[PDB]
Amino acid sequence: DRRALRIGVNGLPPSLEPINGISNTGPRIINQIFDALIRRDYFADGAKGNNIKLVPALAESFERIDDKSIRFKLRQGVKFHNGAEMTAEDVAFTFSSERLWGDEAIKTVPNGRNFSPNWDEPVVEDKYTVVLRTKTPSYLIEKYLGSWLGPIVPKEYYKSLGAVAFGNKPIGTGPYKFRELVANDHVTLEANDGYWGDKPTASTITYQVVAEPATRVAGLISGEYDIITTLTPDDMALVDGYSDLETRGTLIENLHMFTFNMNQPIFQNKTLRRALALAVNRPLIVEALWKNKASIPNGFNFPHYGATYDPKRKPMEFNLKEAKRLVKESGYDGTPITYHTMGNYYANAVPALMMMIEMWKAAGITVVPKIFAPGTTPKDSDILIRNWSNGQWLTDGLTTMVSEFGPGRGVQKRWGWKAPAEFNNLCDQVAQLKDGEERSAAFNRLRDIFEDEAPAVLMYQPYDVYAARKDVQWSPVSFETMEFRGNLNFK
Ligand code: NA
């Protein structure tokens, strides 16, 4: 018979509503309850969980009909876990102004517009045909629909509960249905044997919260968990030493960085930001703390961007002499500069910060750690430097250089980055351009402006480490989620 699967997790998301649950901990549950119109086929063509190939999922087929619209022909007879049939009304509601990107929608789905292209209202043409469209040109609609924005929600059930209550009792069409949630303790899912895709291989999946990695590792050894999440390379020797267990790691499409509150006088100008960027010996941090498993990106540039990945782009430079030169040009007077970090919320954050403080001290810059406890929210006027992480969530270069650092977004509006006019004009263009030499050249120009301006300093692409009992065949994917479709067998 099928075995129950137990996953020892770092935590649970604030909600299981597909958008509001977007976090380091939500997608690994959400991916099981819901399906999107398009699925990223991570293991296609022998790829090691990193293929960017998008394949139809709830959409039987789709045809792009112009630079801003796609007509989807949906699978018919597919049911949500409540017994309701999925139709074009459910898909239109999922990406409607009412639920997702209108002004009232973002009161209960705050990131609905942030994670969306410039949508126009979906058009339901018949029971199973829906045109999803943007107001302005967008050759990124397919990638958005294959991203964490994509999960299809049941209109009648979602509308009767609202986004918050739906988040505590989600209903989707996915291989595993929601059974129960005990806040910050566990989520249990059950096999959806009415699933339109392959039969689920686990009878139940339990995500059990174990805050401390050491206790997660104990639980795996003891037989409490079959898989455990959120380990670092340092934990690999202990786990791999057991003949019944093994680590399963992968580079993830996330970016660890530090950024500045550019409203502060010292960071209004690019000079000290550039001095702080050029003084970081990123290879040293990667060798010492990540066992050379983390990757330094060659600019704001990753292979999963696809046509907008530039493999020939030169690496970001460590130039202590040029950093010292810029410290003098900035007029820095030795006042201590705080670096806000919520402990090791981002893996190895305090150890990396302690190494960077010494690199900054070498360039003649005094940076002091301000390790704020979790839950606390330091006010903006108190932040000088702060660590940040950005999930590189589309299989495209738009996210996050354009989505986070673009015009009207946080880095410019809230954190005062006065980006050069060409950067904002190229940001607007790459959202609308089709992939080609113009689009690829514009991203390289945006990358050059980003490095020149230093609104943030890219540290590295982290290496995520899972551990599992060898009798559970399951491979990680290059994203902060877990995929069990064609990837979960009990030996
Ligand atoms: Na993990």
TrEMBL record:
**Any one GO CC term of the record:** outer membrane-bounded periplasmic space
The record ties this protein, via PANTHER family, to: D,D-DIPEPTIDE-BINDING PERIPLASMIC PROTEIN DDPA-RELATED (PTHR30290:SF38), PERIPLASMIC BINDING COMPONENT OF ABC TRANSPORTER (PTHR30290)
Annotated localization: Periplasm
Note the CDD domains from the entry. PBP2_NikA_DppA_OppA_like_10 (cd08515)
The family assignment reads:
Belongs to the bacterial solute-binding protein 5 family.
Q: Which InterPro entries match?
A: Peptide/Ni-bd (IPR030678), SBP_5 (IPR039424), SBP_5_dom (IPR000914)
**Which Gene Ontology molecular-function terms are recorded?**
peptide transmembrane transporter activity
Q: Which SUPFAM superfamilies match?
A: Periplasmic binding protein-like II
Q: Can the keyword Signal be found in this entry's annotation?
A: yes
Listed A to Z, the keywords are: Plasmid, Signal
Q: What GO terms in the biological process aspect are recorded for it?
A: peptide transport
- The record places domain Solute-binding protein family at 53-396
Q: Name the predominant localization.
A: periplasm
> Know the name of this protein?
Agrocinopine utilization periplasmic binding protein AccA
